[PDB]
């Protein structure tokens, strides 16, 4: 029923690019995402005490949210755009493991993964 540390955000021992396509991941697919009305249940890890949820990490082994995603690329924690992607489908793939087909949080999440693919199918070449 307690909340887990987060996931990290920052490794100072992990290398790291600035790359064209994590250029894009921040100023396009997670700006996209982050701005949208739904996105405000993705912007933050789960809080299990808070929203009642006792047995959300006994299910989920693998949390993810757009806050630390946000911050990872900020802070320049990626080396590659999958490990980013990955990221991305681990949060909508979480969501819809622990909920039921077409509660509201469901639909959310395939409201924020339709933009996500969109904007992923336009992923720039790497530069
Ligand atoms: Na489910």
């Not at 509201?104 to 199918?121: G, S």
């Amino acid at each position: 029923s307690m909340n887990p540390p987060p996931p990290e955000t920052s490794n100072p021992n992990k290398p790291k690019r600035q790359t064209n396509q994590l250029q894009y991941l921040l100023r396009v697919v997670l700006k996209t995402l982050w701005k949208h009305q739904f996105a405000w249940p993705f912007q933050q890890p789960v809080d299990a005490v808070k929203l009642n949820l006792p047995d959300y990490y006994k299910i989920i082994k693998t949390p993810m949210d757009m806050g630390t995603i946000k911050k990872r690329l900020e802070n320049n924690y990626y080396w590659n755009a999958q490990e980013c992607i990955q990221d991305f489908n681990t949060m909508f793939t979480n969501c819809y493991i622990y909920n039921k087909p077409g509660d509201d949080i469901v639909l959310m999440a395939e409201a924020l993964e339709k933009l996500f693919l969109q904007k992923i199918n336009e992923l720039p070449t790497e530069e």
